[PDB]
Amino acid sequence: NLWVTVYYGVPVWKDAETTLFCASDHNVWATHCCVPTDPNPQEIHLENVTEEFNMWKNNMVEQMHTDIISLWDQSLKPCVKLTPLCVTLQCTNVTNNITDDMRGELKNCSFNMTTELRDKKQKVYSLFYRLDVVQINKEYRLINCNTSAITQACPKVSFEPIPIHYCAPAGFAILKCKDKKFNGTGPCTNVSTVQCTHGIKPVVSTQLLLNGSLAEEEVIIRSENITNNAKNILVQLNESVQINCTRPNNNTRKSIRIGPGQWFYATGDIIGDIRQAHCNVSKATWNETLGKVVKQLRKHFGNNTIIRFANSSGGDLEVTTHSFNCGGEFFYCNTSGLFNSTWISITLPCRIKQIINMWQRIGQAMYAPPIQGVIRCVSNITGLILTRDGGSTNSTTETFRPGGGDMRDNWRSELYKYKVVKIEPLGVAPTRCKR
Amino acid sequence: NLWVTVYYGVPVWKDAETTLFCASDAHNVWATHCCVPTDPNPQEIHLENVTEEFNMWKNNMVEQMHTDIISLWDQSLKPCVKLTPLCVTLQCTNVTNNITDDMRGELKNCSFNMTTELRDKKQKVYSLFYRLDVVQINKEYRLINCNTSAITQACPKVSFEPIPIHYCAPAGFAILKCKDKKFNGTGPCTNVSTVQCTHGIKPVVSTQLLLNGSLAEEEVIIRSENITNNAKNILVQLNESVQINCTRPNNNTRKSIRIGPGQWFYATGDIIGDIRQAHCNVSKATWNETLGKVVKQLRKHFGNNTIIRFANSSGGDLEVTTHSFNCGGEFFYCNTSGLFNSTWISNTSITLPCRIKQIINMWQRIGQAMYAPPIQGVIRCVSNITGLILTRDGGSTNSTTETFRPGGGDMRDNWRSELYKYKVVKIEPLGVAPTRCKR
Amino acid sequence: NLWVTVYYGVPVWKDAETTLFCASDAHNVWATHCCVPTDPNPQEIHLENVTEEFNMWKNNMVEQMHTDIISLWDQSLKPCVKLTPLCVTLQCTNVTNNITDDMRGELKNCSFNMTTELRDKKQKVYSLFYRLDVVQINNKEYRLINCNTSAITQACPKVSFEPIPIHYCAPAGFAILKCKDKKFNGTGPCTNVSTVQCTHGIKPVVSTQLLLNGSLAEEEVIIRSENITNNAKNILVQLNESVQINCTRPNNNTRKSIRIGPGQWFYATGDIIGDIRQAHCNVSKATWNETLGKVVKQLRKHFGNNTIIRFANSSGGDLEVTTHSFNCGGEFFYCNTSGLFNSTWISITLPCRIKQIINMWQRIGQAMYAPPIQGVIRCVSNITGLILTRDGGSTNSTTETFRPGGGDMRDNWRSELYKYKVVKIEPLGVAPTRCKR
Amino acid sequence: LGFLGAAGSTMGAASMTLTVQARNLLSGIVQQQSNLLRAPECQQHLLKLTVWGIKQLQARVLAVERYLRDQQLLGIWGCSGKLICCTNVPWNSTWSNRNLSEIWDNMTWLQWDKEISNYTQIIYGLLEESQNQQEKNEQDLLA
Amino acid sequence: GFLGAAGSTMGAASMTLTVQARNLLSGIVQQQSNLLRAPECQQHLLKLTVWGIKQLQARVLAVERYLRDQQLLGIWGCSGKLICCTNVPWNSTWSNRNLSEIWDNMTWLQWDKEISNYTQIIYGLLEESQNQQEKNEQDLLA
Amino acid sequence: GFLGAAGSTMGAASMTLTVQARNLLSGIVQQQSNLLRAPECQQHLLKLTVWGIKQLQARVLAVERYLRDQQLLGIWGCSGKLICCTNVPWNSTWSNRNLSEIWDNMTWLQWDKEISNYTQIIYGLLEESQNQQEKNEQDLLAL
C-alpha cells in the first residue's frame, strides 16, 4: 500500500559547472574582490558521506585561470602605452664597479623620443637589461617591437597576492575532501561542505610551488597518470624550505613625459657598486627534503631504484628557469644547483627582465616599471613540479627534471580538495499515505 | 445565473514585438557568434481551423535581422588593424603586362613611403590596386576614402560565407508559419502551423538578383507592397532556379607587409600569367524561359496587350546600378544590362563582365569602410538565382506599355523575401468565460 | 487571547538607496538619454496625518544626479575627434584690428602647421584664440594651455547641451516623497508630504556663484545651511522672486572647418565681423539692491539683529571659483561679480571673459574644446538663488562678512532636490488579532 | 498534441490541453540555457558581446516578470495553485449576450478573446474585490 | 493611490492591502511598457553599457525581493492570502497594548517602530509552528 | 544545518527539508546584501562588463530554477507543501521493495540511483492525475 510522496528540500547534490564568485577579507585582486567573506565559515561535517573527487578534471581551476587573466588585463587596461619607445636605441656598455658577473647584462641606451609638443624631440637615456634588448645587424631594438604592443603597468598598482576566497552562489555548494594523505582522485571518506574555499594566494611561479598549503603528515606525490612521462607530477612537501632572494643594486628612477600627461618610467643610474641578483636555499634542508621526495617516489617504482635529479631542458626562460615575481620585479632563477644529486646554503643566480610576456599569449607585452632602492624577498617553498625522463628499459635509475610552465597547475595544487555541486531539492519516494 | 470562470494556460496569442535569438545547425563569423544548437528535429505543429493575418511589409523580424547583421559585422572588424598608415601619396603607373583590352587601365601599380615597425624608420613598398579604389590628385594618387573615413582591414582569418541561420523564439513567444501556396505577402492565411524556430536562412547579401534563397513552389510569385505604386519595389520569387557561374580568372599572389608591432597589411602582389576580366555566365535559353514566366505573372495585374519591357538600370553608383556579388570574400560589381534588354509582346550563354573593388562601404553607411585583403590563386563560384528585385518606371502613367528595371539596394528586402511567411506572437495564458460553476 | 496575524500590503517604508530612472516629456544630450516620457498625469497622493524627517544635505538623489550628469557628459564627448594633433608651437600676434580698450591683449591671431588628410602633407592655417587658453613659451611662440597636462577632445558640433527639465522616477518597490513646507528648515520633521511617481522637472543648469533657472522659495526669502554656525559651510540662499540677468557676446563671429584627417574635422574660430567688444552681463541695480536687503534681514536671524553685514567680492583661485561661470549657447563666460557684492547693510554691468578649452566637473587630465558659435550671443536668465560663504570673523562680534562661494556642483542640485526623499516600501508586518487557525 | 495544439478547437474542448501551455511557457527557459551548455567554449565568446548579453538578459528577465505578474494576479483573485477556478462574481451577460452552450461550443478561445476584449479590466477589478471581501470575512469568522 | 492613506490607522489601512500588494510587479511590467513607447530609441540606450547593467540589476533585485517574501509566507503557511491567522500567540513584551489602541488609533508606521526589535523572533516562531503542522497533517491523512 | 544529515536515513533526513527550501532565496538576497556592504569597492565592478553579465546570469538562472520547481509542484497540487501525497500509487517495479527497504538506512543520495530514469515517467503521471481531479471539481461545484 505505498503511494507517491513528492518531497521538496531533499539533501541531494549533483556534480555541476557554475560560476563562482571571488571574496576578500591600489591592489588589483583586493580591489576586484569586493564581497567580504564570512569571518567564520560554517563548515558542515557530513556524516556517512563518501564522495569522488578528481583534481585533474576540476573546473574550479579553469575559472581561477580565467579570472586571473581577465583581471590582469583589466588592471592594465587604462595604462599608458609605450609605443613611442619603439625606436632605434644607441647602446653602450655600463662600466661602474661591476663585479665579475653581469658583464654583458646591463646596458646604457640613449634615444630620440617626442616631447609634449608634437613638433619637438628630446634626447633621453635609460638603463636596460640585456634580456630585453636585441641587436640590429650600437643599434638595438626593444625585444618585443617585432611582435607586439608594449604597455606600461600603472606604477600605483599592486599585484601582491592576497588570499582570495572562492564562494558558491546560492543554489550551489562546495564539497571538500578532508582525508589525510588524499591521492587527488577517487573516493574520499572524510568530507564536509563549505560556502567558500580557504583563501588561495594567486602566486605566480614556474618550477617550484611557492607560498601554498603545506602537506599534512607526509610528503605527498600526486599525478594524473604516474606511468605516463608526458604528465607533470605535483609534489607537496610536509615541511617548508625557506628561500631568501635579493636584488642588491640600489636603483633610482626618472619620469619622462612622452605626451600630454603621458609618462614613462625609466630606469635610472645604479647608486654604488653593481652586484648580481640571487636566491639562498638552505643546503641541509634541501638535501633532506629531496631525499624525502625520493622515498615517496620509490613507492611507485620499486625498492631497488635509484632516483637521479637533473636540471631543466631547453626552451623559453619561463620554462628553463624558475620565474619569480617579487615586489613587482621579475626574476629568472637558475635552479640547476637544486637538482644535481643522485639518490643511490645553495646559491642560485637570477637574471632580471622588465618586458614580460606573462601568459602563453604573445600579443600583450607588459613593461614592469623599475623599483627604487633594493629589494629583499622571503618565501616558503611548498612544492615542486616534476616530470619523468624519456622511455627506457633500465629501471635501475630514473631521472627527474623540473617541469611546469603551465600556470593552471599552480592552482590545481590548492583546489585539488574542492568540488562544486548543485543542489536538487525535488524528488520522490513511497509512503504509507495517500490523498 | 451563469458565473465567471477563470482559466490559466489558455492557447491564445497576440501580435508582439520581442527579441529573437540566433541558433545554428550542427572562425566563420556567422557561426562563432551563434552558439545555440538547433533542434535536429524541430516540431511543426499544424493548427487545425486557424486563420491568421500576415503582413511581410510590416514584419519586425526583418528589422531585427537587419540590425543583428549590422551589429555582427561591426564586431568582426573591431579587433583588426586599421589601415590609416596607408593614406599617403601614391606614385602610380598603369600595369602593362599581357592585359586584355577590356582590362586596360583597370589595374594600377602604386609605390609609396610607409613606416615600418620602428617609429624612426621608413620603407618603400608597392602593391597593385584596382582603379575603383584609387583617385587622382589634381602619377600622384590617393585612396578614395582618404578624405571621408578610416578604413579597417578585414581579418585575414575570418570567413564571411553564409551559414543557414535559424531564428528562435524566447519562452512566452511562438513563431507562426504561413504554408499557403501562393501567399503573396499580405492578408489572411488558412494553412498555418507553429514552430519553435524558423528554417535556416543564409544571410546572403546582394543587390538586384537574390541568390541562394527559397525557391517558390508551383507558380512564380510576384509580391509587392502596392503593385500600383511606382515608388515601391517588387520582389519576384522564381519557381525554378537559374544557375550562374562566376569567376575571377587572374592567378594572384599576396604579400604581407610588416607595418607595426604586431600589425600586418595584406597587399596584392603581381598577377601570374595573363590578365583577364572577371565575369559571370548565365544560360541564355534558361534566362529567356524564366523571364517569360515572370512576364506571364505580371500580366495578371497589368493587362493582355500592355507591352512589357525590361530595361537597364538607372543611374547611381555601383551599389545600385550593378549587381552586387560577394563570393570567396571577393567583391564583384557585375553589369546586368545583358539580362534586361527586351520587349515582350502579348501572345507571341550570356556573359556579364564584372569589376573588382577592395574598399567596401557595405551597409550604405558612410564614415566607415572595410578593406578586403586579396585572395591568392583564382576563384570560382556557382550559385542559384532565386529571385529578382524590380521597380516600375513611373513616367508612363497613361501608356500602351510599362517598363521594369532592376532595383533594390535596401538590404532589408533581401530578408523580407525569406521571412515573409513568418510572424511573431506572444502567448497570453489568462482568460475568462461564463460557467455553470460557482464557489 | 492575542494571536499573531501576518499581513502583506502594509503601507510602511524605510529610508533607502536605489538608483532612480530618468524620464522626459514630449541632437540634445538629455533628450537623447531620457527617452522614456513621464506619465502625462503623475497625480500625487497627499499623505494626510504623516510627518516625515528630511535631510537635504545627505540626500543621495544629489549624488545620483551628479554621477549621471557626468557620465552622460563624458559619453557625449567620447565619440568625437581628438585635438591631440593641434598641440604644436603656435606663432601668435595681437589682433589690433577694430579693438576697443577693454579687449586689448585678449584676442590673439595664431598660425600653425597641422596635418591634412594625407599623412605626407601639412597645411599652414590660422585661427583666433582667447588669451585664457594660450600660454607663452619662454614672444611669438605659444602653446595651448593643456599641452602639459591633458588630452583635449573636441565637443561634437551637433550636440546641444541645453538643459531640459528632467524627472527622476522611482523603481518599482520604491517611492518618492516630497514635503510641501513653505518654511522648510532643510532638516527634521516636515508636514504636507505627498507621494509622487517622479520628481518635478529639474533642469541640469551649471553655474557657480549664482544659481540660475530654479524654484523661488514659495513666499519668502530663505536661508539654509548645514551647520550654520560654521562659516565653512556653504549657505544656499533662495529668493522669493527672480532677478533677470541679460548676458551678451557682442562680437559677430565666423567659423571655419579644417580637415584634420579622414572624416575628421576641426572647428576653428575665424575672423570677427565688426568691432571687437567685451562680453558682459546686465543686472538691474534696484532689483539687486532690494534683493540683498531681504537676504540680510534673514541672515541676521543667525548672526544678530543689530549685526552689520557686508557683502564682499570673491576670494582667489580658478575662474570657476572667483567668477560666475556661465554656460550659454554652448560658450563659456566667466563674469566678474564683484559689482554685485560690494555693500554693507546696517543697471550694474559685469565684464565677462570667453574661454573655449574647459575642464568641467572639477577634474583634470581630460578637457573639452567648445567649437565656436557664429553670429552673436544674446542670453536671458533668471537668478533664483545665491551661494555664500562666511568669513571666519576672528574676534569680530560687531560686523560679519559674506563672499560668493560655491563651485561644488552638488550644491546646484540640493537647491531643487531638498524637498525629495526616496524610501523603500516594506509590505510585510504583523499585528495581534482575535483569530487563530 | 503540441504547444498550441488544437488552437482552433472549441473553448470547451481546449480545456484538455490547458496544462501544456501553462508549463511550456516557463520551462522552455531552462531548456534554452541547456542548449547553450552544449559548448561553454562558444558561450564564453558570446559573453564578450556586450549588447547581445544585455538583450538576452532582458529577454529572460521579462519572461520571468510576465510569469510572475500573472501568478500574483491569480493569487489576488484566490486561484493560486489552480488552472481552473470558480468565483463569486456572476456573469453580467452584457459582456457577451450569449448562452453557455454557444460559447463553450462552436467557438474558439481566439474568437472569444476578441469578442470580450473590452471588459478585461472590468472583470479583473471585480474579481479582486470579491477576494478582498472574502478574506476579511474569513478573518472575522475565525476571530 | 500607491501608498494610499499611509497616515490612516491600521484597521483602515487593511482595506487596501491588495493595491499595495500588486504594485511591485505591475510597476515593473509597466516600466517595460513605457520603454516600448519609443522602441526605436532602445538601440541608443543599449550603447550605455553601464546604464544597461544597472537597469538589469534593478529589475533582478526587485524580483528577488518579491520572491523571497512570497517564499517566506509559504514557509509560514500564509501563501495565497494577504491576511494570515496563525497559531503563534502574541507576547505582551513585544507590545503591552490592547486591541483598541492598536487597531483604531495607531497607524502602521507607528506600530512598525514600536515592535521593530521582534521581527526576526516572530518569524522564527512562525516557521517552527508550520513545520510541526505539516508533519501532523501527513500522519492524520495516513 | 545547510546539508547536515545528508548521509542519514531518508526518513530522518526529512526533518530539515524546510531549511533547504529557504536557503536558496535567502542566500541570494543576503549575498547581494553582503556585496553592497562596501559600495566604494562594488562600484568598480561596473567596469567588469564580463563579471556584470556573469553574475546576472547566475542570479537569473537560480531564480529560473526556483520558479520551475515551484510551478511544477503547483501543477501537481503540492503548492505550499514539502511532503505532499498524491493519489498515484508507488509502482512496485520502480524500487521492488517494502517501505522499510527504502528507509533501510538508505540516504537520499543513494536513493537517487534507485529512481534513476523513472523520474520523467513519474512526473508525467503526476500531472495527469491532477488534470483529472481539477476537472472533476469544475463539474462537482456546479450542482
Ligand SMILES: *[C@@H]1O[C@H](CO)[C@@H](O[C@@H]2O[C@H](CO)[C@@H](O[C@@H]3O[C@H](CO[C@H]4O[C@H](CO)[C@@H](O)[C@H](O)[C@@H]4O)[C@@H](O)[C@H](O[C@H]4O[C@H](CO)[C@@H](O)[C@H](O)[C@@H]4O)[C@@H]3O)[C@H](O)[C@H]2NC(C)=O)[C@H](O)[C@H]1NC(C)=O
Ligand atoms: C551559393 O551556394 C554555393 C554553394 O552551394 C556557394 O559556393 C561555394 O562558396 C564557397 C566559398 O567561396 C567555396 O568554398 C571554397 O572551396 C575551395 C575548394 O577547394 C577544393 O580543392 C582543393 C584543392 O587544393 C581542396 O584542398 C579543397 O578541400 C576542395 O576540395 C577551398 O579551397 C576554399 O578554401 C579557402 O577558405 C578556407 C576557409 O576555411 C581556408 O581554410 C582555405 O585555406 C582557403 O583560403 C573554400 O572552402 C565552395 O567551393 C563553393 N561551392 C561551389 C560549388 O562553387 C556560393 O558562394 C553561394 N552564393 C552566395 C552569393 O552566397
Ligand SMILES: *[C@@H]1O[C@H](CO)[C@@H](O[C@@H]2O[C@H](CO)[C@@H](O[C@@H]3O[C@H](CO[C@H]4O[C@H](CO)[C@@H](O)[C@H](O)[C@@H]4O)[C@@H](O)[C@H](O[C@H]4O[C@H](CO)[C@@H](O)[C@H](O)[C@@H]4O)[C@@H]3O)[C@H](O)[C@H]2NC(C)=O)[C@H](O)[C@H]1NC(C)=O
Ligand atoms: C534659462 O532659461 C532661458 C529660457 O529657456 C534660456 O534662454 C534661451 O536659450 C535658448 C538656447 O540657447 C535660446 O534659443 C536659441 O536662439 C538662437 C537665436 O535665434 C532666435 O531668434 C531668431 C530671430 O532673430 C529665430 O529665427 C530663431 O528661430 C530663434 O528663435 C537660435 O539660433 C538657436 O538655434 C540654434 O541652436 C540650437 C541649439 O539647441 C539648435 O537646436 C537650432 O537648430 C539652431 O542650430 C536657439 O533657438 C533662447 O532664445 C533663449 N531664450 C531667451 C529669452 O533668451 C537660458 O539659456 C537658461 N539659462 C541657463 C543658465 O541655462
Ligand SMILES: *[C@@H]1O[C@H](CO)[C@@H](O[C@@H]2O[C@H](CO)[C@@H](O)[C@H](O)[C@H]2NC(C)=O)[C@H](O)[C@H]1NC(C)=O
Ligand atoms: C572685478 O574687477 C575688479 C577690477 O576693478 C577687481 O578689483 C581689483 O582687484 C585687484 C586685486 O586686489 C586690485 O588690485 C584692483 O585695484 C581692483 N580694482 C580696482 C577697483 O582698483 C575685482 O577683484 C574683480 N572681481 C572678480 C569677481 O573677478
Ligand SMILES: *[C@@H]1O[C@H](CO)[C@@H](O)[C@H](O)[C@H]1NC(C)=O
Ligand atoms: C659591450 O658589451 C658586449 C656584450 O653585449 C661585449 O661583448 C663587448 O665586449 C662590450 N664592449 C666593450 C667596449 O666593453
Ligand SMILES: *[C@@H]1O[C@H](CO)[C@@H](O)[C@H](O)[C@H]1NC(C)=O
Ligand atoms: C591514485 O593515483 C594513481 C595514479 O598515480 C591511480 O592509478 C589510482 O587509481 C588513484 N587512486 C584512486 C583511489 O583513485
Ligand SMILES: *[C@@H]1O[C@H](CO)[C@@H](O)[C@H](O)[C@H]1NC(C)=O
Ligand atoms: C614528513 O614526512 C616524512 C615521511 O614522508 C616524515 O619522515 C617527516 O617526519 C614528516 N615531517 C613532519 C610532518 O614533521
Ligand SMILES: *[C@@H]1O[C@H](CO)[C@@H](O)[C@H](O)[C@H]1NC(C)=O
Ligand atoms: C646529503 O647529501 C649527500 C650527498 O648527495 C647524500 O649522500 C646524503 O644521503 C644526503 N643526506 C640526506 C638524506 O639529506
Ligand SMILES: *[C@@H]1O[C@H](CO)[C@@H](O)[C@H](O)[C@H]1NC(C)=O
Ligand atoms: C496578394 O496581394 C493583393 C494586393 O496586391 C491582396 O489583395 C491579396 O489578398 C494578396 N493575396 C495573397 C494570397 O497573399
Ligand SMILES: *[C@@H]1O[C@H](CO)[C@@H](O)[C@H](O)[C@H]1NC(C)=O
Ligand atoms: C497603396 O496602397 C495604400 C493602402 O495600403 C494606399 O494608401 C496608397 O495610396 C496606394 N498607393 C497608390 C500609388 O495607389
Ligand SMILES: *[C@@H]1O[C@H](CO)[C@@H](O)[C@H](O)[C@H]1NC(C)=O
Ligand atoms: C533646523 O532647526 C534647528 C533648531 O531647532 C537648527 O539647529 C538647525 O540648524 C536647522 N536646520 C537647518 C538646515 O538650518
Ligand SMILES: *[C@@H]1O[C@H](CO)[C@@H](O)[C@H](O)[C@H]1NC(C)=O
Ligand atoms: C519677497 O518678499 C518681500 C517681502 O514680503 C516682497 O516685498 C517681495 O515683493 C517678494 N518678492 C516678490 C515675489 O515679488
Ligand SMILES: *[C@@H]1O[C@H](CO)[C@@H](O)[C@H](O)[C@H]1NC(C)=O
Ligand atoms: C533685459 O532685457 C529686457 C528685454 O528682453 C529689458 O526689458 C530689461 O530691462 C533688461 N534688463 C537689464 C538689467 O538691462
Ligand SMILES: *[C@@H]1O[C@H](CO)[C@@H](O)[C@H](O)[C@H]1NC(C)=O
Ligand atoms: C475543425 O473543424 C472540423 C469540422 O469542420 C472538426 O471535425 C475538427 O475536429 C475541428 N478541429 C479541431 C482542432 O477542433
Ligand SMILES: *[C@@H]1O[C@H](CO)[C@@H](O)[C@H](O)[C@H]1NC(C)=O
Ligand atoms: C453589466 O455591464 C453594464 C455595462 O457596463 C453595466 O451597466 C451593468 O450594470 C452591468 N451589470 C451588472 C453586473 O450589474
